[PDB]
Specification:
Radius of gyration of chain A: 22 Å
Structural class of chain B: alpha+beta
Order of helices and strands of chain A: HHHHEHHEHEHEHHEEHEHHEHHHHH
Number of helices of chain B: 7
Helix content of chain B: 40-55%
Distance between the termini of chain A: 64 Å
Strand content of chain A: 5-15%
Number of strands of chain B: 4
Strand order of the largest sheet of chain B: 2-1-3-4
Largest interface: A-B, 54 and 38 residues
Order of helices and strands of chain B: HHHHEHHEEEH
Number of strands of chain A: 8
Largest sheet of chain A: 4 strands, mixed
Oligomer: 2 chains of a larger assembly
Radius of gyration of chain B: 18 Å
Shape of chain B: elongated
Bound molecules: iron/sulfur cluster, FE2/S2 (inorganic) cluster
Chain lengths: ~400, ~160
């Protein structure tokens, strides 16, 4: 775990290689990686960093990697934070030099505490490690690390919000037009990315770009941490190549029971937000990210939720929105409506009191709700809401027929 | 109603470091964090002086109090059982554990023991879904606990 495992993994062995590099060389180096965002944005990782292209501004730039993802799990991001922290650390040091930022801050998940501590402590061994700092790693560019505990915002998750959390002042999205994402949070240039990107990018660079990159369909580059939670015997994290069989994935899970088979029905592929699936749909994955969209899939989170056949469709999805209910940050006047309208609206369906049309109506709300937004997180949450109507609601439309039963049940 | 951040302040003083040049906002987050340790159920009086250390107007700090879920307004059972009620965990059937647990614990899901070692929370996503049920006890963590097992877990602190 701590430095020896850290020494032991032989992290930073590259780092020495790193000193010699080659950062412009590194940066294209990703492009061959053609590293897309691991969080789900997908923009060229090279593209994102490249965007810095800093030249000279008075202020220091800064880079930070989320360590915080609340997506509702599976907690893949957290697990990565725990097992081989340093490896993340090295990646942090290595990449950052690429952008040529003086130092980096990593902002962690609020729930974690004891979990958080090890990361700094591994972080502590770093100065102790003496790999880089001051004059560093035979590299003039400086190195600094700061990690900040957190308030606890799923809202804090938005990039504008994440940069803002560092701001620690009523996090909201900064203003979308204005970025220039790099400038100027914490008062200056600063690019951001999901942690897996932060670390994995470090290993790939050390490795020849092709080995990681060659792996999978050219829709998706290299490898991914998939995690699953379901009404099946095995749930957890499985580090797997992009583009494999879902049902094959189901088999790795040893998911219970069967599938399609006893019982249905749907899986929310990414995390929760992307469109849910159907039993017929499941044969399709193929979990390459590009693969999902055409489906209207979009397993950006890479943490599956199996939602079992023997349950109320309205019942699970509805419980799910609430979280969206908790979520609203407040920056958009409309999204207060956004959670509202849905959640209160959502409940009626779940109780089964409400009349036929309202199902249709909700749909209307969805697009308008989706009409425009500050976020983002909010938009994504709504969109997942949408697919609910098709398929499962398409099933729920029947489920609502069950509401009819409530209607029959009325007297 | 007279909180003092002085003796542990030197530790607090470092917190001052984290940003560069102007502003102490970065300290904000740190500061409140320091405080919850100082007293839980932290109080307005504590904030204001914290603002002085902070050097910002109360409402400014006050805006901060709203937003972060973490800071706690009054008092909690020193035991503060954060019980996740979100889908995934729900998908865990967890919910039954809490209900069974509430009966065992003794107060509506909303309240805390008159004994006051504990203070339940309905919590939303604890960001450990693969591990559900996940229970965050105080600073610490408990993972997928049997109802009998959950009772046993409550027990030991209870001692
Ligand atoms: S959509 Fe909601 S959560 Fe997103 S920025 Fe707007 S108010 Fe905040
Ligand atoms: S957003 Fe244009 S009026 Fe407030
Ligand atoms: S749902 Fe309970 S931890 Fe994510």
């Amino acid at each position: 775990x701590x430095x020896x495992x850290x020494x032991x993994x032989x992290x930073x062995x590259x780092x020495x290689x790193x000193x010699x590099x080659x950062x412009x060389x590194x940066x294209x180096x990703x492009x061959x990686x053609x590293x897309x965002x691991x969080x789900x944005x997908x923009x060229x990782x090279x593209x994102x960093x490249x965007x810095x292209x800093x030249x000279x501004x008075x202020x220091x730039x800064x880079x930070x990697x989320x360590x915080x993802x609340x997506x509702x799990x599976x907690x893949x991001x957290x697990x990565x934070x725990x097992x081989x922290x340093x490896x993340x650390x090295x990646x942090x040091x290595x990449x950052x030099x690429x952008x040529x930022x003086x130092x980096x801050x990593x902002x962690x998940x609020x729930x974690x505490x004891x979990x958080x501590x090890x990361x700094x402590x591994x972080x502590x061994x770093x100065x102790x490690x003496x790999x880089x700092x001051x004059x560093x790693x035979x590299x003039x560019x400086x190195x600094x690390x700061x990690x900040x505990x957190x308030x606890x915002x799923x809202x804090x998750x938005x990039x504008x919000x994440x940069x803002x959390x560092x701001x620690x002042x009523x996090x909201x999205x900064x203003x979308x037009x204005x970025x220039x994402x790099x400038x100027x949070x914490x008062x200056x240039x600063x690019x951001x990315x999901x942690x897996x990107x932060x670390x994995x990018x470090x290993x790939x660079x050390x490795x020849x770009x092709x080995x990681x990159x060659x792996x999978x369909x050219x829709x998706x580059x290299x490898x991914x941490x998939x995690x699953x939670x379901x009404x099946x015997x095995x749930x957890x994290x499985x580090x797997x190549x992009x583009x494999x069989x879902x049902x094959x994935x189901x088999x790795x899970x040893x998911x219970x029971x069967x599938x399609x088979x006893x019982x249905x029905x749907x899986x929310x592929x990414x995390x929760x937000x992307x469109x849910x699936x159907x039993x017929x749909x499941x044969x399709x994955x193929x979990x390459x990210x590009x693969x999902x969209x055409x489906x209207x899939x979009x397993x950006x989170x890479x943490x599956x939720x199996x939602x079992x056949x023997x349950x109320x469709x309205x019942x699970x999805x509805x419980x799910x929105x609430x979280x969206x209910x908790x979520x609203x940050c407040x920056x958009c006047x409309x999204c207060x409506x956004x959670x509202x309208x849905x959640x209160x609206x959502x409940x009626x369906x779940x109780x089964x009191x409400x009349x036929x049309x309202x199902x249709x109506x909700x749909x209307x709300x969805x697009x308008x709700x989706x009409x425009x937004x500050x976020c983002x997180x909010x938009x994504x949450x709504x969109x997942x809401x949408x697919x609910x109507x098709x398929x499962x609601x398409x099933x729920x439309x029947x489920x609502x027929x069950x509401x009819x039963x409530x209607x029959x049940x009325x007297x | 109603x007279x909180x003092x951040x002085x003796x542990x302040x030197x530790x607090x003083x470092x917190x001052x470091x984290x940003x560069x040049x102007x502003x102490x906002x970065x300290x904000x987050x740190x500061x409140x964090x320091x405080x919850x340790x100082x007293x839980x159920x932290x109080x307005x009086x504590x904030x204001x002086x914290x603002x002085x250390x902070x050097x910002x107007x109360x409402x400014x700090x006050x805006x901060x109090x709203x937003x972060x879920x973490x800071x706690x307004x009054x008092x909690x059972x020193x035991x503060x059982x954060x019980x996740c009620x979100x889908x995934x965990c729900x998908x865990x059937x967890x919910x039954x554990x809490x209900x069974x647990x509430x009966x065992x614990x003794x107060x509506x899901x909303x309240x805390x023991x008159x004994x006051x070692x504990x203070x339940x929370x309905x919590x939303x996503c604890x960001x450990x879904c693969x591990x559900x049920x996940x229970x965050x006890x105080x600073x610490x963590x408990x993972x997928x606990x049997x109802x009998x097992x959950x009772x046993x877990x409550x027990x030991x602190x209870x001692x």
